[model samples]
Each structure stands twice: as C-alpha cells, then as structure tokens.
Target chain A: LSLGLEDKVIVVTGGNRGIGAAIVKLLQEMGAKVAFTDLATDGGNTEALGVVANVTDLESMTAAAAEITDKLGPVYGVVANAGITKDNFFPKLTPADWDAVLNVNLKGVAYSIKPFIEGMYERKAGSIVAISSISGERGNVGQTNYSATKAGVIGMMKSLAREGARYGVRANAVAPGFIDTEMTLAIREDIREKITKEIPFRRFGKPEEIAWAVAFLLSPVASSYVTGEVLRVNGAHHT
Target chain B: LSLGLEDKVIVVTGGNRGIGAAIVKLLQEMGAKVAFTDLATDGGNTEALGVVANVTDLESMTAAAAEITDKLGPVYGVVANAGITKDNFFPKLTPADWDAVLNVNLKGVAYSIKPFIEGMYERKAGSIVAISSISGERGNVGQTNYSATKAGVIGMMKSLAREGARYGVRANAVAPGFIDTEMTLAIREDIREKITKEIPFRRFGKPEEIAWAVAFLLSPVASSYVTGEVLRVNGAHHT
Candidate 1:
C-alpha cells in the first residue's frame, strides 16, 4: 500500500504471537528493521529478530532496546500490543490482578518506549502506535482491570505525544474491537455468537486489519499531521 | 441555570487573576466552596478562600490541598487552570520556556492531584478538570512547548480517570478556543478582530462559559457517566 515504512526501524512488543506476530511480519515485509520481544518460550513464525523479555520489566526492556539500536540502528517507531486477561468479576478481582494488568498493559508501554524516546527526540522523526481494546472504552462485564489499563494506554500516548512534539515524534493509539485472534477463538461458542450479533459487520476482524492501522501510524507521510490522537477500528462497536 | 453544582467544593489554580480568577468567581457564585492557589501579591476580590502558593511547586500544591481539605473536610473537585505562555518559534524556543510550561501546566496538575488522588480513591467521589488549549489539540505556530504541556495534561487525565474509576474519581479535561481572557484583550485590537473572524463562533468566548463547562464536569449529576474524557467547549473550533 506504499505506506512508506521502508528502511524504518520498528519494535513490536509480544511479537511472538497473535496480533504482535502479525505486526512483526508485516513491518518486515515492508522493508523495516523490526525488533520484537515476548516472554514466549518459542518465537512465532517471522524472520524479524525476537528477544525474550517480559514487558512488565523496565530493565529487560532497556536491554532489548540497546540490542536493537546496536544491531539495527535507530528506532523510529513502536507498537505496544502485549496484553493478558485474568478473568474475574469486580468483587472477586484481586489487587494482584490489578497490578498485573497495570504493569503489563500500561507500564509495559512506558518500558518499551523509554530508550527510543531520547533517540527519537534527537532525530526529530518517530511514531508510536499502541494497541488498545474496545473493551476498555466500552465497559465490558467482568473486565474492570483490563478495561482500565487499556484505556490508560491511550491517555499515556497523548502525554507522550505532547512531550515528543518538539522532536516531531508522533504518538497515536488504536482501540480494536472483537478480532479473530487466538484469545477470541477460545471464547464459548454462544458468547462469540452474541458478540458477533452486536458487531455491525457481524464478523470478527482480521488481524491484518488492525496491523494496517499500526502500519499507517508508522508512516510519516500518512499521519504526519496527526499526533496525540486515538483511532478506534472496532467495526462501529465503539459508537 | 441549575447545573447542579450546589455546595460542592471546587478548587482552581492560579485563581487570583486572569482566567483562573474568572473561574473562581463563577464557582463561588454557584455556592461551591471554591479554593484557589495564586502568587499574586496584589489581593484580588476576596470572594473565595485564596491560598498563596506557586502552581509550579509540589510543596505549594500539597499545602493548598491540605488547607482546603482541612477546612472543607474533602475537596469534591479541582480545576488545573494555571498556565504561562512564552512566545517563541521552534528554533528559538529555549529550554527554560519549555521547562516552565511543563512545570506549571503539566507537572503542576500532577502535583495538585497527587495528594488528593488517594483521598479521592478512598472517598470514591471526586472530579478533576484540567484546562488544555486549542493549540494542544491542533498544531499552532510558536506554541510547541505549551502544546506539549497542555496536551500532556489531558493524557495524564485520561490515565488518572482509569486509575480513579475504581475509587470513584472522574478525570476530564477542557480545551478552550480563543477566549476573551485578559491576555487576548491585551492584544492589538486589529489582531483580536482577525482572530475572532477565524473562529466559528465569530467572537472570543467569555470566561464564564468556560467556567460553566468546568462546573458541569464537576457535577456528579451532569457527568455521572463521564470519566477519562475531554469536553471541547471551543464553539465548534474542532481540534
């Protein structure tokens, strides 16, 4: 689609599986130096470099960023998409669960971007796309913690956009609706059907669709005038 | 006329003069326990309780919050209303100006609420309204630093909303258009006319209008379902 990603250096957290894996493959195919990190024992199908690191740890994230800079040079963009869901109702939700959700979903984005922020500031050209969930914006039953963290990521992106403005670094976030990922596939059949009925398109979104949104944010020509913005690609579910 | 702000305790930053003063007067007239922080040696009209403090310093903010809390029991809401402007283009914008904007406009909001955040969480009922600007939402010439701080406040508000939701605190921000504040009135008449023509409303907004929006956000009944959202009362100057 001529998204202008060629020769760019990009990082996608949790790139070993699901949506992250798809983004890693797409960026590489577009001729970008893509570095990804995941806690998975085995990296998913993708020729892009994969580093094993838990997203919740800043030190691990720093080391990963250093490795990428040493090998692939400057990083121009990132997609923070690693997430986990611990299912429980509000009364049953534990403090540990809240901490886990915040550490990974919100702070993970901070960890991923810390090293690149200075470089991007110096270069005056960079982009960031954080993957959020429609569940966060629209209150989902039994996902209070997950929803809070997902929404916080968008808020943090706006803050980054403000801080990065002088250096021409742009930050935007995307909230995806029901996508046909492994997690969604594991949902009960009846629950999935009910969810699909509410979707205007009446079907689950492809991983590539969300990946395309990330790719657009990475392209300076496409989103040059856009920063501190949040895009919802949820097939009208968000409205 | 009844926006439901009766007897609610509201705090405004930099409330001794300018736009902050306007907000302070409006809240006082609405039967709110309006507390404000300011550095003005020249006393303003003693319509509300005024505390001498600097918006840029955490110590000042803590003292103000503690004073208000001690007298009123607990603050129901806050307005991050203090700001400064240093006119300079991108290349000429100095580090001092940038830091000044970040300190008052950005960090000040953080400090203002840092002490009250846990209290709000415990009480499970509080509101925070951050004042951003049109320049922060839409790119404006020679306002890179101001835009960053203004925009960052909104981002921080969004995250705070998510975090505060569990504690019953709602965080929102307001982006004002060309308002007829003291600063705008001080501009050349010809320039003011030119600026007003560009606005859809065709006139600079009254400070009272901005105050009304802030009051509405603080009202539990007015924005009961709202949190981590921004109200753009820009008279259709959509950013």
Candidate 2:
C-alpha cells in the first residue's frame, strides 16, 4: 500500500483523543512527520509530535503551523479535524451556541489551513482533508448550529479546490455519520438504538473507519486528483 | 455567466430522452459543440449532433467517439450518463439482472471514455462526468444490481482521477436521488410518497437539477481541481 506518506509533513487538529488521535497515530505509523494540536496533551506519546494550541484562535493555529514547518519542513498534507457541536432545537438555538460551534468547527478549519496553504502553493503540491459530519448535510434535529458549521466546511472546501487547482493543491472533505466516539456515545441509549436501526449496517461505525478516509484523502498516490469532494463514511446511514 | 463552454467539443451518451436529453439540451444552450449518442434517434431535435450508437458495445462507442472528433474536432469533455436498472430484491436477483445492469451502466461508461481518454491525455486537458445513483451509496431493498453498478462508477472514477491527474484530465460522478424522471415515475405511488417525505425539501427533484451538477463538473473554472468525486443532488434525501 504505497500511500506516498513517508516523511511527508502532515498536521492534524484535535489529535489528543478520539478520531483525531486515530488519524495522528496512523499517519505516524505510515512514516509521516505528524504534528497534532490540541489544547490538552495526549498523556503519553513520545513518538508523535504534540503542539499545545487552540484551534479557534488564529494566532495559536498559525504559531503551531510555523513550529511544525520549522521542525519537519513544509507541510505536504493537512487534516482539519477539530470540531465542536452545540445541540439545540432550531427555535431554542441561541446566538452563543451558534457562534461557539461555528468558531470551533468552521473558523478553526480556516485558521488551521491558512498558515500552510501559501507554503503548499509554493511547493505546488499538497492534500487537505477536513472532517465534517453527516448532520451538516442532513440537518439533524437539535443540531442546527453543528449542522451549519459542518455544511460550511463543505462549501469552503469547494471554493478552495477551485483556487488551488493551478497550484497543484487538493482539498477534500470527509463526512462521518454516527460513530462510536465519545461524542456519539453521549446520546441517549434509546435514541442511539433508533438511529442505528436506520443504518443499513445496523451499527455505529468505529473511529478507525473515519480515520482511514482521512488518510486516503491526504495521500497523494491514493487521491492525487481528488479535490472539492466529500467522502462520506457513515455506514449508509445518510448515504 | 461565462461558463467557458463555448465551442468546446463535448459528448454525451443516452441522449435520446430523459435525463440524457436534458443534459444534451443544457450543454448545447451553454454554447458547447455538443454531440450526443443514443441507440435510436430522438425524433424531435436535430439541432445538435446525434450519433446512433449502442453504448453496451465498445466498437459502437469507439466509432461514435471517432465520428464526433472528426465532425467537431478534439473532445474536451465526456458525460457518461447511459445506465439501466433491472430492479429486484437481493434474494430474487438473477445473474442476468446483475450482468445486464453492470454491462450497460458500468462497462458502458468505461467503453465510452476509452476512445477519447488518449486524445485528452495528449492534449493535456479533459473532464469526464458519469451519472450514478444514490442507491449506489446507500443500498436499496429492491435494487441490489442497480446499486452495485452505481457504486462501481464511484470506484472507477476515483481510479481514473489518480491516473489522469498528470495529464490534466479529471473524472467525477453524480449520484442523483429520486428525481422527476421517467425511470423514477415508474415507482409505486405509495412508495414515492414515503420516499418524498424523507427528502428535506419534501419533493422530487427536477431533471434540470441533475443536469446542473453535470454541467458544473464538466466546467473547468467551476471544478478545475475536482475529481474522483460523487456529487449528490438528491434534495437532501440521502444527505
């Protein structure tokens, strides 16, 4: 499986736990220079580089990107996977909830990639993958804010793809459905069961499934011309 | 308003009627030198070039490609939209059903592109869009064979995107959900209502909507960096 990821500088956001952690670990195993950012540290990990940064702040994200490049060279790939959800009904959704989720999920992705894009364009080679959610596409109940931000990710990626084409930079997105992450497990048991039944596979997908998609999109050999695309890994739940 | 479609040689398959007709019409209106093919004549329109060819047979498709090139000059875009479905439950699906659908829907697309791919590579420019179905991503109860072939389209497009990257050629797919097409109208009224209710927009999509996606994918300025993608136009039915 020649993914062409070996020694390539790749960065991931929210890499301390859950799906983000899975992506960071896999990239490291593939012999890539993987730098992960999270507000909190991943308790014990000496091999994978960790950067303490807040995604919502451009200053923190820009600094983290600069440090990664200084240590590992120009970024060849990026996974914008940090996101937050503020679940509330449409009428009950407040400005604060909307702004908070949008700041983290949408604006965070923009900040994470801004620092690396110019470098990518100079090299004329890069692959960017954003982790979106199915709720963004389908507009889940009590997830108005979350859905807007997720949907915004897709629109942003499309625009980036058009702008990056001539520079040989690629941008794509991954929309994950119900997965067995801490975020999803927090759902009430009865609701979880009901949602699982809707999925053809009749189960919640593992974090690794989403991570694999992120890896594929970030790999040059695997997805060289894949841009402005949203790969859904939701067990046909929202196919 | 400038789609950059003016005078570009474009080809479409199954253009006699239905969604194919809509695409051919739209492409022509967009100012492209459109040449469309069907097994039989469309009877009504004679404005655009129409070649009688069987997409199932590679020889016919190849001949059509040559004819189009001779008449309209080098090909700039190809839309492989000819597909068929033999609806049947999984248990009741026959080998004939599977092979028939795959041959026309999947293999037909391959044959359609084979003749022109080399030319496009030589020119270092081309765009290909294959019409898939939502069932391909989410398996339907009575469309086992249909779903398999549709899913195959996405896989085939991804491989093509990787191979065509260096040549500046792109390949993509469009998975349309329930639309107001002749094929979809054949569905049971009760079933149609149930499915319509699931769509966020609460209605069946128009054929023009799917055509719009095809046109966008075929346009360089709009989707220059987009490839190996399956754009879903299902009124948020599958989201």
Best by DockQ: 1
- lDDT per model vs. reference: 0.77, 0.82
Model 1 CA deviation exceeding 4 Å by range: A1-21, A35-173, A177-209, A216-230, B1-7, B39-42, B53-62, B83-128, B139-172, B180-197, B219-229
Question: Lowest-scoring 10 consecutive residues by lDDT in candidate 2 chain A?
Answer: A219-228
Which consecutive 10 residues in model 1 chain B have the weakest lDDT in total? B90-99
| Clashes, model 2 | 0
- The DockQ value obtained for model 2 is 0.04
Q: Give the per-prediction TM-score of chain B.
A: 0.94, 0.97
Across B1-239, the per-residue lDDT of candidate 1 in tens digits comes to 47567788888888887778888888888788888888872446575888888876767778888988888768788888988887665435544665576567765666676666667667788899889777766645556556655655665566567667777778888888888877888999998887777888878888888888888888888898898787887887764
Off by over 4 Å in 2: B1-103, B106-239
User: Alpha carbon lDDT of residue A97, candidate 1?
Assistant: 64
